[PDB]
Design a protein around this ligand. Structure first.
Ligand SMILES: *[C@@H]1O[C@H](CO)[C@@H](O[C@@H]2O[C@H](CO)[C@@H](O)[C@H](O)[C@H]2NC(C)=O)[C@H](O)[C@H]1NC(C)=O
Ligand SMILES: *[C@@H]1O[C@H](CO)[C@@H](O[C@@H]2O[C@H](CO)[C@@H](O)[C@H](O)[C@H]2NC(C)=O)[C@H](O)[C@H]1NC(C)=O
Ligand SMILES: *[C@@H]1O[C@H](CO)[C@@H](O[C@@H]2O[C@H](CO)[C@@H](O)[C@H](O)[C@H]2NC(C)=O)[C@H](O)[C@H]1NC(C)=O
Ligand SMILES: *[C@@H]1O[C@H](CO)[C@@H](O[C@@H]2O[C@H](CO)[C@@H](O)[C@H](O)[C@H]2NC(C)=O)[C@H](O)[C@H]1NC(C)=O
Ligand SMILES: *[C@@H]1O[C@H](CO)[C@@H](O[C@@H]2O[C@H](CO)[C@@H](O)[C@H](O)[C@H]2NC(C)=O)[C@H](O)[C@H]1NC(C)=O
Ligand SMILES: *[C@@H]1O[C@H](CO)[C@@H](O[C@@H]2O[C@H](CO)[C@@H](O)[C@H](O)[C@H]2NC(C)=O)[C@H](O)[C@H]1NC(C)=O
Ligand SMILES: *[C@@H]1O[C@H](CO)[C@@H](O[C@@H]2O[C@H](CO)[C@@H](O)[C@H](O)[C@H]2NC(C)=O)[C@H](O)[C@H]1NC(C)=O
Ligand SMILES: *[C@@H]1O[C@H](CO)[C@@H](O[C@@H]2O[C@H](CO)[C@@H](O)[C@H](O)[C@H]2NC(C)=O)[C@H](O)[C@H]1NC(C)=O
Ligand SMILES: *[C@@H]1O[C@H](CO)[C@@H](O[C@@H]2O[C@H](CO)[C@@H](O)[C@H](O)[C@H]2NC(C)=O)[C@H](O)[C@H]1NC(C)=O
Ligand SMILES: *[C@@H]1O[C@H](CO)[C@@H](O[C@@H]2O[C@H](CO)[C@@H](O)[C@H](O)[C@H]2NC(C)=O)[C@H](O)[C@H]1NC(C)=O
Ligand SMILES: CC(=O)N[C@@H]1[C@@H](O)[C@H](O)[C@@H](CO)O[C@H]1O
Ligand SMILES: *[C@@H]1O[C@H](CO)[C@@H](O)[C@H](O)[C@H]1NC(C)=O
Ligand SMILES: *[C@@H]1O[C@H](CO)[C@@H](O)[C@H](O)[C@H]1NC(C)=O
Ligand SMILES: *[C@@H]1O[C@H](CO)[C@@H](O)[C@H](O)[C@H]1NC(C)=O
Ligand SMILES: *[C@@H]1O[C@H](CO)[C@@H](O)[C@H](O)[C@H]1NC(C)=O
Ligand SMILES: *[C@@H]1O[C@H](CO)[C@@H](O)[C@H](O)[C@H]1NC(C)=O
Lengths: 179, 436, 49, 197, 50
């Protein structure tokens, strides 16, 4: 097995030596030298995603480590993983490196997740911001207050709907057994 | 042999007509799934874990991982879109008035509760707890059913919109309907007192606005009681929430199936990859390993293919839910049975885990009474036809009343437009048409 | 590399997976003490003809 | 805004190239060239290698057809929706909210597009709202008067009746208001004179 | 392989002997006797409907 090894709180019966969890992987093994039970969890793993304003709009990028504690990932560990000096934000999605969290709320541009979005804004830099649901309007309900429009505006809006896809045919024999 | 239903016979005659004399305001619940868990799978370590040799064959086998990652990504992106279209219909966040008096109508159950930590309605909090049986950033145990997936790589991506943000959207929709009715949906929100707005909706279903006004207290008592019955009906364990529960059960069943396919040999000598690499020589190992990769690849493909089909069903439900959002909640809808059962008055949306619950306020006629009726009345040689009602005979004097509620009126020239002659029409009954 | 294009558009793209590599190897003694008596057979006062 | 049409082209194109790249996949064989296997392998052992290649190509073909079929259903659902929007919006006025444009739907105009249809929805949007004082009904001679098709409105001095969507104040008349019941039953009733022509 | 052979207009470097398409199938080659870059294309194909 390959993983970080820690002590195991769960008890083991005398006959049983190792224990496999619902994942069916051995999650606890008793040490043959010292019968004390030890808990085994695999070395931390996760997928990386890159947030980029676009190749046209500079080469500054921010990277988010999915489902991993910010302290869990070291700055050393192919890429340099930027630096601790670079802004580090811990989110429900994971740890995000290279973006400034701001208290101003803006409409989403790149969806990080869990209400967090990032955009390239100016001194242009990638900033992570909390979702802005929209403008807050309070309408005065009353016993006797009503509003009636005194004018109108005619608006034209566009709806685009796919109708058909490109018809395709396959000559099976030459794809599978060509020439 | 099952019964299709109760057998009822309705007496049909030329002359008999039934006009309701009372109404029951009924609130019904509609539950529609809106989204599923966004899942991402690390292809390589699903196929084989810490297997440096397997990385060579997997790279040699092809780039199958790229399409599966892309296909899963498309599902995940689409899932966040579905909740956006259903909930983010209104751009402007609307705040509930500090005054909670709405002409006797009580909205405390559906309105968000400031006392409760999460800014959720009492119904919404009850809905969450009923479904919370199916649902770890700390991952303290795991560096427990969730880990059985991440230990293999099957990972759940948090939704872009959290529940609080969804709850804010639902409260904003609630505020617009109470304060502005249909006006906030089409254009800028215009304040209108609630009794007038419900009176307006009464005109939509075909009942004159006066009927509501005298019976305002009775309607308010009926509506307030009806909301209360929803709480205990939802509190009943047999619920339509299983439809929402089915989505999570479907996700769980698929996730477990992938775990079993790991232990599934697919005809291999040993399910464990380590045994394949250890006991056998490199020539013999490849044949056994290759059969393992093909079996693992097929299970992943079937999961993605099954997930795509299930995702399409949620998309159809999401589009239906979004249509129900606009057509029913935002305004009165004349489509029969689209929102609730009976004539639709208005709808209230309440957020649910991975879904939305619709509370449809409907007008149900009751206490019908038989009456004898004639197509037209002959008064002075010219037939008279009711303008917007039906000629109803009390048995001694004829009357004209609206077709959904019994309000007898004396026949007048204003009540009935004149046309044609008397002899042409069949069943015309002689009477006197009072001229004001 | 993942997009297989020199230009990349605005958005977020999953690219790879980061994993911590094992620091060193461990093998575990079963505390076996069933030693052979061949030594006293070797340390035998007399040997056969 | 034509990205939806663009995405359909991209998905069909990208999947088509995907099948091409799967040709180079080894599928556990010796070579991805079928003729090379025939030359390099004698017929008995060649069958084992060819079969591995054959299923690999066959599985890729099966996946592409399955992806297309699922994609076809999605387009068909859009097409059925678009056909409904053709009839419901262009051919006539539709009272369904937000089905045909945003706001009250006056009309819709169709415009053809490559592999899609573009809808131009002409919509009526109210504006320039003005607040007012309103009453459910007017008590004039002991009988409650309700607005027949309007809403009772006064700017502060004189009550009027106007249509809900647009502000046009008319003097209260018997033709303007239908009368039923008495004054006491209706809450919020307001005293005013109902003029008789 | 089987196909129709014409002179290849593609400029072909001295160390280069084989040309490959997007699918990586060999589309150009130099004749062994005299180095002559020749494009290889499949013989004419087409679906038939009745
Ligand atoms: C019509 O009535 C009064 C006239 O000023 C308005 O009441 C206040 O309006 C301002 C801005 O419109 C709001 O900020 C206040 O909150 C309102 N008062 C209360 C107690 O809520 C009312 O808003 C006017 N209506 C419209 C549509 O302008
Ligand atoms: C409407 O005006 C009335 C005052 O007549 C208020 O609503 C309630 O009125 C009763 C009876 O006067 C009071 O006992 C309640 O306390 C009032 N409700 C509240 C929440 O105080 C209220 O001022 C107005 N309602 C609105 C503007 O929604
Ligand atoms: C209602 O419609 C528009 C406002 O939306 C007004 O039209 C404008 O009128 C001013 C002055 O008459 C002109 O300077 C603008 O050029 C007009 N705009 C357009 C687009 O035509 C109109 O006057 C408004 N009328 C009322 C009574 O509210
Ligand atoms: C109005 O009166 C008619 C005549 O009596 C009713 O018709 C009969 O009603 C009884 C009981 O209501 C049924 O058992 C009979 O079967 C009916 N006649 C036929 C031919 O079916 C009619 O039902 C009354 N209306 C209502 C609403 O009760
Ligand atoms: C309705 O009234 C008509 C009388 O006009 C009757 O129904 C049928 O009417 C035709 C034409 O007058 C006659 O030829 C039939 O014999 C009538 N049928 C019966 C069963 O009478 C009848 O009085 C009424 N229909 C009912 C009661 O169902
Ligand atoms: C219509 O409304 C209800 C039935 O829908 C009934 O009203 C009841 O009247 C009694 C008599 O005091 C009350 O005790 C009940 O509480 C009322 N019902 C409800 C739900 O409040 C009756 O059938 C009709 N009442 C009227 C006024 O038309
Ligand atoms: C609206 O209904 C709720 C629910 O009955 C009322 O809240 C109740 O108030 C009583 C007395 O204060 C308490 O004993 C209950 O525990 C409350 N129930 C809940 C669910 O909070 C509320 O007072 C009503 N408000 C109006 C304006 O009618
Ligand atoms: C038809 O309706 C009328 C009106 O409700 C009823 O006749 C009334 O009877 C009372 C005394 O019983 C008189 O004071 C009214 O003047 C009568 N009204 C009219 C218009 O004549 C009559 O009872 C009803 N018919 C049936 C069969 O119930
Ligand atoms: C309603 O009354 C008229 C007039 O009283 C009836 O018309 C018939 O006209 C013929 C020729 O003018 C006469 O026999 C009588 O004046 C009427 N006959 C009968 C039998 O009343 C008409 O028939 C009456 N309709 C009903 C349904 O009774
Ligand atoms: C509310 O009602 C009407 C609508 O503006 C106003 O009455 C008019 O006032 C002007 C100003 O002198 C007169 O020229 C008109 O003849 C009046 N019309 C009628 C029908 O009386 C009234 O003034 C408005 N209230 C306020 C405070 O402006
Ligand atoms: C405060 C008020 O309006 N009170 C009136 C009173 O003036 C009138 O005499 C009576 C009968 O019409 O009705 C009530
Ligand atoms: C993309 O690059 C071109 C060429 O440099 C540039 O003109 C264009 O503005 C860029 N697009 C964006 C969105 O920056
Ligand atoms: C913004 O909010 C954070 C916590 O949410 C707080 O630490 C900080 O002081 C606030 N202000 C600024 C300017 O960051
Ligand atoms: C990360 O770990 C630290 C301590 O190890 C803990 O305090 C913190 O809450 C963790 N972060 C998350 C998001 O769980
Ligand atoms: C309207 O005037 C009548 C006549 O005095 C009176 O009885 C009634 O109470 C008045 N209504 C209001 C709301 O002032
Ligand atoms: C054979 O080919 C080589 C170079 O490819 C060269 O000697 C010559 O072109 C050929 N020989 C003859 C005799 O044609």
């Amino acid at each position: 097995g390959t993983g970080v090894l820690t002590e195991s709180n769960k008890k083991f019966l005398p006959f049983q030596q190792f224990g496999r969890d619902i994942a069916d992987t051995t999650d606890a093994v008793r040490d043959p030298q010292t019968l004390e039970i030890l808990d085994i969890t695999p070395c931390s793993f996760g997928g990386v995603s890159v947030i980029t304003p676009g190749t046209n709009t500079s080469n500054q990028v921010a990277v988010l480590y999915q489902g991993v504690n910010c302290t869990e990932v070291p700055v050393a560990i192919t890429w340099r993983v930027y630096s601790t000096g670079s802004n580090v934000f811990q989110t429900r999605a994971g740890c995000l490196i290279g973006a400034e969290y701001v208290n101003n709320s803006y409409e989403c541009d790149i969806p990080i997740g869990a209400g967090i979005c990032a955009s390239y804004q100016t001194s242009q830099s990638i900033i992570a911001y909390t979702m802005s649901l929209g403008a807050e309007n309070s309408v005065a309900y009353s016993n006797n207050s009503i509003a009636i429009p005194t004018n109108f505006t005619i608006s034209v809006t566009t709806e685009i709907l796919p109708v058909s896809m490109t018809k395709t045919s396959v000559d099976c024999t030459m794809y599978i057994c060509g020439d | 042999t099952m019964s299709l239903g109760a057998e009822n016979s309705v007496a049909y005659s030329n002359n008999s007509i039934a006009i309701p004399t009372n109404f029951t305001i009924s609130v019904t619940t509609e539950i529609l799934p809106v989204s599923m868990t966004k899942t991402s799978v690390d292809c390589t370590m699903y196929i084989c874990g810490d297997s440096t040799e397997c990385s060579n064959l997997l790279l040699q086998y092809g780039s199958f991982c790229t399409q599966l990652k892309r296909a899963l990504t498309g599902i995940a992106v689409e899932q966040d879109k579905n909740t956006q279209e259903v909930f983010a219909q209104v751009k402007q966040i609307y705040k509930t008035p500090p005054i909670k008096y709405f002409g006797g109508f009580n909205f405390s159950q559906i309105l968000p509760d400031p006392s409760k930590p999460s800014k959720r309605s009492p119904i919404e909090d009850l809905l969450f707890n009923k479904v919370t049986l199916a649902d770890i950033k700390q991952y303290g145990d795991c560096l427990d059913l969730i880990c059985a997936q991440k230990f293999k790589g099957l990972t759940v991506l948090p939704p872009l919109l959290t529940d609080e943000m969804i709850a804010q959207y639902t409260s904003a929709l609630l505020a617009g309907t109470i304060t502005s009715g249909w006006t906030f949906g089409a254009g800028p929100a215009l304040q209108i007192p609630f009794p007038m707005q419900m009176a307006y909706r009464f005109n939509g279903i075909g009942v004159t606005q006066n009927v509501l006004y005298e019976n305002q207290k009775l309607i308010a008592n009926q509506f307030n009681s009806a909301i209360g019955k929803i709480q205990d009906s939802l509190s009943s364990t047999p619920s339509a929430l299983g439809k929402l529960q089915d989505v999570v059960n479907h996700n769980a069943q698929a996730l477990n199936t992938l775990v079993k396919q790991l232990s599934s040999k697919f005809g291999a000598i040993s399910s464990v990859l380590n045994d394949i690499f250890s006991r056998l020589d490199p020539p013999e190992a490849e044949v056994q390993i290759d059969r393992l990769i093909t079996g693992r690849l097929q299970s992943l493909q079937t999961y993605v293919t099954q997930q795509l089909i299930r995702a399409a069903e949620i998309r159809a439900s999401a589009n239906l839910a979004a249509t129900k959002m606009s057509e029913c909640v935002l305004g009165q809808s004349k489509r029969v049975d689209f929102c609730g059962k009976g004539y639709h008055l208005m709808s209230f949306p309440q957020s649910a885990p991975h879904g939305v619950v619709f509370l449809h306020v409907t007008y149900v006629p009751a206490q019908e009474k038989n009456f004898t009726t004639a197509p037209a009345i002959c008064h002075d040689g010219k037939a008279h036809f009711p303008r917007e009602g039906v000629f109803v005979s009390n048995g001694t004097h004829w009357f004209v009343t609206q077709r959904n509620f019994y309000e007898p009126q004396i026949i007048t020239t204003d009540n009935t437009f004149v046309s044609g002659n008397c002899d042409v029409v069949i069943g015309i009954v002689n009477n006197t048409v009072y001229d004001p | 590399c993942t997009l297989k294009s020199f230009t990349v558009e605005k958005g977020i793209y999953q690219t790879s997976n980061f994993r911590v590599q094992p620091t060193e190897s461990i093998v575990r003694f079963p505390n076996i003490t069933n030693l052979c008596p061949f030594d006293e057979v070797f340390n035998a006062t007399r040997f056969a003809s």
